[PDB]
Homo-oligomer: A and B are copies of this chain.
Amino acid sequence: KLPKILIVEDDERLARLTQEYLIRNGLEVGVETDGNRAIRRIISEQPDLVVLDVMLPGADGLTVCREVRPHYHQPILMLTARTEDMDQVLGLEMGADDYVAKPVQPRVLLARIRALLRRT
């Protein structure tokens, strides 16, 4: 009954800090650091929501979004370390549900995760 979140992020330090905060707030959270494994993992485990970094070893965020959408219908929240309008429009038009600039306050990330889960 706890929402399952998958954090796809290559920055291990930030990913674990975020995972611990979300677990303390009633979420079941896993971490993936590779785009290729993230594609198979998202399709196989079917998490309730994905937090997806744009730049990853292997498949980048846009590729992950494109490859899972036909087999994964749950929300995708993208995170970026640099605010560029082009990448934000492409991420949303590719099928992402949100696109947030890093760094994001942990409580804001949780509020955005809860908002996305309300329409599933």
Shortest C-beta distance, A86 to chain B (Å), equals 6
Query: Which of the listed residues A62, A69, A93 has the most CB atoms from chain B within 10 Å of its own CB?
Result: A93
Interface residues of A in 51-93 (CB under 8 A from B): 62, 66, 69-70, 85-86, 89-90, 93
Chain B hits for A70, CB < 8 A? 69-70
A30 within 8 A of B: no
Instruction: Using C-beta atoms within 8 Å of the partner chain, give the interface range for chain A.
Output: 10 to 19
Interface of A, helix, strand, loop or mixed by DSSP:
helix
> When each residue 78-120 of chain A gets 1 if its CB lies under 8 Å from chain B and 0 otherwise, what string results?
0000000110011001110000000000000000000000000
Chain B hits for A90, CB < 8 A? 89-90, 93
Q: CA separation between A62 and B70, bound complex, in Å? A: 15
Shortest C-beta distance, A70 to chain B (Å), equals 4
Q: Is A66 a contact partner of B89 (Cβ separation < 8 A)?
A: no
Q: CA separation between A53 and B55, bound complex, in Å? A: 31
Chain B hits for A86, CB < 8 A? 85-86, 89
Given contacts A62-B93, A66-B69, A90-B93, 7 further A-B contacts (CB under 8 A): A66-B95, A69-B70, A85-B86, A86-B86, A89-B90, A90-B90, A93-B94
